[PDB]
Protein backbone atom coordinates (compact mmCIF):
# COMPACT_ATOMS: atom_id res chain seq x y z
CA UNK A 1 0.00 0.00 0.00
CA UNK A 2 1.68 3.23 -1.19
CA UNK A 3 0.93 6.90 -0.61
CA UNK A 4 3.42 9.25 -2.34
CA UNK A 5 3.64 13.06 -2.81
CA UNK A 6 5.21 15.08 -5.69
CA UNK A 7 5.34 18.58 -7.31
CA UNK A 8 6.64 17.37 -10.71
CA UNK A 9 4.63 17.87 -14.00
CA UNK A 10 5.71 14.33 -15.04
CA UNK A 11 4.05 12.72 -11.97
CA UNK A 12 0.92 14.96 -12.44
CA UNK A 13 0.16 12.24 -15.05
CA UNK A 14 1.90 9.12 -13.49
CA UNK A 15 -1.13 7.19 -12.12
CA UNK A 16 -3.42 7.53 -15.19
CA UNK A 17 -0.82 5.61 -17.28
CA UNK A 18 -0.87 2.68 -14.72
CA UNK A 19 -3.16 -0.16 -13.57
CA UNK A 20 -3.93 -0.10 -9.78
CA UNK A 21 -2.63 3.51 -9.34
CA UNK A 22 -4.65 6.61 -8.35
CA UNK A 23 -3.61 10.24 -8.98
CA UNK A 24 -4.82 12.80 -6.42
CA UNK A 25 -4.05 16.33 -5.15
CA UNK A 26 -4.79 18.53 -2.09
CA UNK A 27 -6.80 21.66 -2.96
CA UNK A 28 -5.46 25.26 -2.93
CA UNK A 29 -7.64 28.43 -2.88
CA UNK A 30 -5.84 31.08 -5.01
CA UNK A 31 -8.49 33.71 -4.02
CA UNK A 32 -7.33 33.54 -0.34
CA UNK A 33 -3.82 32.28 -1.30
CA UNK A 34 -4.49 29.50 1.29
CA UNK A 35 -4.58 25.67 1.17
CA UNK A 36 -8.05 24.18 1.76
CA UNK A 37 -6.28 20.92 2.85
CA UNK A 38 -9.08 19.01 0.95
CA UNK A 39 -7.86 15.73 -0.67
CA UNK A 40 -9.25 15.42 -4.25
CA UNK A 41 -9.04 11.69 -5.16
CA UNK A 42 -9.00 11.35 -9.00
CA UNK A 43 -8.04 15.07 -9.62
CA UNK A 44 -4.32 15.94 -10.17
CA UNK A 45 -2.77 19.17 -8.83
CA UNK A 46 -2.56 22.23 -11.11
CA UNK A 47 0.31 24.67 -10.80
CA UNK A 48 -0.72 28.29 -10.14
CA UNK A 49 2.68 30.07 -9.92
CA UNK A 50 1.81 32.90 -12.36
CA UNK A 51 -1.68 33.45 -10.84
CA UNK A 52 -0.16 33.66 -7.33
CA UNK A 53 2.60 35.96 -8.72
CA UNK A 54 -0.08 38.24 -10.32
CA UNK A 55 -2.08 38.34 -7.02
CA UNK A 56 1.25 39.31 -5.30
CA UNK A 57 1.87 42.10 -7.92
CA UNK A 58 4.26 40.57 -10.55
CA UNK A 59 3.98 42.55 -13.88
CA UNK A 60 1.76 41.08 -16.66
CA UNK A 61 4.60 41.39 -19.26
CA UNK A 62 6.86 39.10 -17.11
CA UNK A 63 4.00 36.58 -16.71
CA UNK A 64 3.27 36.82 -20.48
CA UNK A 65 6.96 36.18 -21.30
CA UNK A 66 7.25 33.27 -18.80
CA UNK A 67 4.04 31.66 -20.27
CA UNK A 68 5.79 31.84 -23.73
CA UNK A 69 8.73 29.75 -22.38
CA UNK A 70 6.25 26.92 -21.48
CA UNK A 71 5.26 23.99 -23.75
CA UNK A 72 1.79 23.96 -25.37
CA UNK A 73 0.85 20.81 -23.33
CA UNK A 74 1.71 22.48 -19.95
CA UNK A 75 -0.70 25.39 -20.56
CA UNK A 76 -3.54 22.99 -21.56
CA UNK A 77 -3.18 20.69 -18.46
CA UNK A 78 -3.40 23.34 -15.71
CA UNK A 79 -6.28 25.11 -17.62
CA UNK A 80 -8.23 21.80 -17.89
CA UNK A 81 -7.74 21.20 -14.13
CA UNK A 82 -8.95 24.82 -13.49
CA UNK A 83 -12.09 24.18 -15.66
CA UNK A 84 -12.78 20.84 -13.84
CA UNK A 85 -12.15 22.48 -10.41
CA UNK A 86 -14.40 25.48 -11.29
CA UNK A 87 -17.15 23.02 -12.46
CA UNK A 88 -16.74 21.18 -9.10
CA UNK A 89 -16.84 24.54 -7.18
CA UNK A 90 -20.08 25.41 -9.09
CA UNK A 91 -21.57 21.97 -8.21
CA UNK A 92 -20.59 22.45 -4.49
CA UNK A 93 -21.96 26.06 -4.28
CA UNK A 94 -25.23 25.21 -6.10
CA UNK A 95 -25.53 22.12 -3.81
CA UNK A 96 -25.04 24.32 -0.65
CA UNK A 97 -27.92 26.58 -1.86
CA UNK A 98 -29.94 23.38 -2.62
CA UNK B 1 21.91 8.58 -10.82
CA UNK B 2 25.66 8.29 -9.92
CA UNK B 3 24.90 9.43 -6.32
CA UNK B 4 21.89 7.04 -6.04
CA UNK B 5 23.95 4.11 -7.46
CA UNK B 6 26.70 4.78 -4.92
CA UNK B 7 24.18 4.94 -2.03
CA UNK B 8 23.03 1.40 -3.06
CA UNK B 9 20.02 2.09 -5.33
CA UNK B 10 19.59 -1.10 -7.48
CA UNK B 11 20.95 -0.96 -11.07
CA UNK B 12 17.55 -2.05 -12.54
CA UNK B 13 15.82 1.00 -10.90
CA UNK B 14 18.54 3.33 -12.30
CA UNK B 15 18.23 1.60 -15.72
CA UNK B 16 14.42 1.98 -15.66
CA UNK B 17 14.65 5.60 -14.34
CA UNK B 18 16.75 6.58 -17.43
CA UNK B 19 13.60 5.47 -19.41
CA UNK B 20 11.22 7.20 -16.91
CA UNK B 21 12.95 10.41 -18.21
CA UNK B 22 11.02 9.55 -21.46
CA UNK B 23 7.84 8.06 -19.81
CA UNK B 24 6.11 11.41 -20.51
CA UNK B 25 3.30 13.15 -22.59
CA UNK B 26 1.44 9.83 -23.37
CA UNK B 27 0.75 9.84 -19.60
CA UNK B 28 -0.49 13.47 -19.97
CA UNK B 29 -2.98 12.56 -22.75
CA UNK B 30 -4.25 9.73 -20.46
CA UNK B 31 -4.44 12.25 -17.56
CA UNK B 32 -6.31 14.73 -19.85
CA UNK B 33 -8.90 11.99 -20.63
CA UNK B 34 -9.49 11.68 -16.82
CA UNK B 35 -9.62 15.53 -16.50
CA UNK B 36 -12.30 15.86 -19.22
CA UNK B 37 -14.25 12.85 -17.81
CA UNK B 38 -14.12 14.41 -14.29
CA UNK B 39 -15.29 17.78 -15.76
CA UNK B 40 -18.15 15.95 -17.63
CA UNK B 41 -19.20 14.22 -14.34
CA UNK B 42 -19.10 17.54 -12.42
CA UNK B 43 -21.37 19.09 -15.14
CA UNK B 44 -23.78 16.07 -14.97
CA UNK B 45 -23.87 16.35 -11.11
CA UNK B 46 -24.48 20.13 -11.44
CA UNK B 47 -27.36 19.47 -13.93
CA UNK B 48 -28.90 16.92 -11.48
CA UNK B 49 -28.43 19.42 -8.57
**Phi, psi (deg, nearest 5) at residue A27:** -65, 145
| Residues of chain A contacting B38 with CB distance shorter than 8 Å | 42-43, 84, 88
CB atoms B46 and A94 under 8 Å: yes
Can you tell me the distance from the alpha carbon of B34 to that of A12, in angstroms, rounded to the nearest whole number? 12
Resolution value (Å, 1 decimal): 5.1
Can you tell me the distance from the alpha carbon of A84 to that of B13, in angstroms, rounded to the nearest whole number? 35
Q: Is B49 on the interface with A (CB under 8 A)?
A: yes
C-alpha dist (Å) from residue B24 to A4, A36, A46, A54, B28? 18, 29, 17, 29, 7
* DSSP code, position A33: T
Contact assessment for residue B31 and residue A14, using Cβ atoms and an 8 Å cutoff: no
| Residues of chain B contacting A81 with CB distance shorter than 8 Å | 35
Q: How was this structure determined?
A: cryo-EM
Can you tell me the distance from the alpha carbon of A90 to that of A46, in angstroms, rounded to the nearest whole number? 18
Amino acid sequence: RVLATTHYPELKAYGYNREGVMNASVEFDIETLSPTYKLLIGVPGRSNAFEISKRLGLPDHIIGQAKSEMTAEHNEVDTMIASLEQSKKRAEEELSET
